[PDB]
Design a protein around this ligand. Structure first.
Ligand SMILES: NC(=O)c1ccc[n+]([C@@H]2O[C@H](COP(=O)([O-])OP(=O)(O)OC[C@H]3O[C@@H](n4cnc5c(N)ncnc54)[C@H](OP(=O)(O)O)[C@@H]3O)[C@@H](O)[C@H]2O)c1
Ligand SMILES: O=C1NC(=O)[C@@]2(CCOc3ccc(F)cc32)N1
Length: 316
């Protein structure tokens, strides 16, 4: 039902997907069921979201009830940076694929470029709260991930929260077998990513926009923070088209050929978020929205800003 962005592999990635970060156990299964019924085919998942098993339950049931075929679903997951060491890449992936109850993933992403210390903690810190870096790097991780593609377990690899310098480092890696098909990064009218998007597309790499609604449910939201959903200029453009702000925020990416993955566990909103192929933002409206860029990140991960491959010190 969503249109598709063509990947460098010629696979078709549905341009709208369901986000699952912060979707609680006990709600996410129904959210995915509702989404599939509404015509979503792309679901965005991650090991670190700690809810992939419920996502897997929903997909499995919808497939068995013949609501959807596996071939028409596009499931993305991510390798968390505590798992960059070779045996850990496979073990992390295997837990993800098992939880999701799939025989293959459509895309597996490096979740963040900066490595974290391996062990039991997802967010390893020292006695000052600073992230502890790891031994293996994302280049090491990538090599282990390429094996998954060779074995038919993953159709395509991608990256997330990478700057152009880091994509360069990957594309230049000696013996590189597979190129990233997407870079999943924060993107919305307050962080328009013009240079990064330009760079990615010029390398034949798609962009997946995360937190497109401004992630209002992120734990660290402060009342004074920018709030896209409440932005009167966005709402004004919405009103013109008799749509909601969320729908304009989602449509914005579609018109830049950028994949977008709004999260909701509210059934009415899940449905609302995909009613975005029946209107069109004018050229003037796109330019106005583009002009709202504030270089504001809802997802900064400042706790890890000291690590070698922290991505957000670069200009883009
Ligand atoms: N790669 C990464 O590092 C990374 C980082 C962040 C996010 N992501 C991915 O991107 C997805 C989306 O980003 P996000 O979860 O940060 O936030 P988001 O999708 O920008 O916003 C989610 C919030 O918006 C609300 N909402 C959804 N639809 C709405 C609507 N139509 N009207 C009003 N409110 C609405 C949701 O409430 P309800 O759910 O209560 O309806 C939820 O609180 C994530 O879930 C995750 O899959 C990836
Ligand atoms: O979808 C997300 N991927 C992430 O790395 C992030 C952004 C930064 O904050 C956190 C914290 C916990 C978590 F599970 C996830 C996250 N949200």
């Amino acid at each position: 039902m969503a249109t598709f962005v063509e990947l460098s592999t010629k696979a078709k990635m549905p341009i709208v997907g369901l986000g699952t970060w912060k979707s609680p156990l006990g709600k996410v299964k129904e959210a995915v069921k509702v989404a599939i019924d509404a015509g979503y085919r792309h679901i965005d998942c991650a090991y670190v979201y700690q809810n992939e098993h419920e996502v897997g339950e929903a997909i499995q049931e919808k497939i068995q009830e013949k609501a959807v075929k596996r071939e028409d679903l596009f499931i993305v997951s991510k390798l968390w940076p505590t798992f960059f060491e070779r045996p850990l890449v496979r073990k992390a992936f295997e837990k993800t694929l098992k939880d999701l109850k799939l025989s293959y993933l459509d895309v597996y992403l490096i979740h963040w470029p900066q490595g974290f210390k391996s062990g039991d903690d997802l967010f390893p810190k020292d006695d000052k709260g600073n992230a502890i870096g790891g031994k293996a790097t994302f280049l090491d991780a990538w090599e282990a991930m390429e094996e998954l593609v060779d074995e038919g377990l993953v159709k395509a690899l991608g990256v997330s929260n990478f700057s152009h310098f880091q994509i360069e480092k990957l594309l230049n890696k000696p013996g590189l077998k597979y190129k990233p098909v997407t870079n999943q990064v924060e993107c919305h009218p307050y962080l328009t990513q013009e240079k990064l998007i330009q760079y990615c597309h010029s390398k034949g790499i798609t962009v997946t926009a995360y937190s497109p609604l401004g992630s209002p449910d992120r734990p660290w939201a402060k009342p004074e923070d920018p709030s896209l959903l409440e932005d009167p200029k966005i709402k004004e453009i919405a009103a013109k088209h008799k749509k909601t702000a969320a729908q304009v925020l989602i449509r914005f990416h579609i018109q830049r050929n950028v994949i977008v993955i709004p999260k909701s566990v509210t059934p009415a909103r899940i449905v609302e978020n995909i009613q975005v192929f029946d209107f069109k933002l004018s050229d003037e409206e796109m330019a106005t929205i583009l002009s709202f860029n504030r270089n504001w990140r809802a997802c900064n991960l400042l706790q890890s800003s000291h690590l070698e491959d922290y991505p957000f010190n670069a200009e883009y």
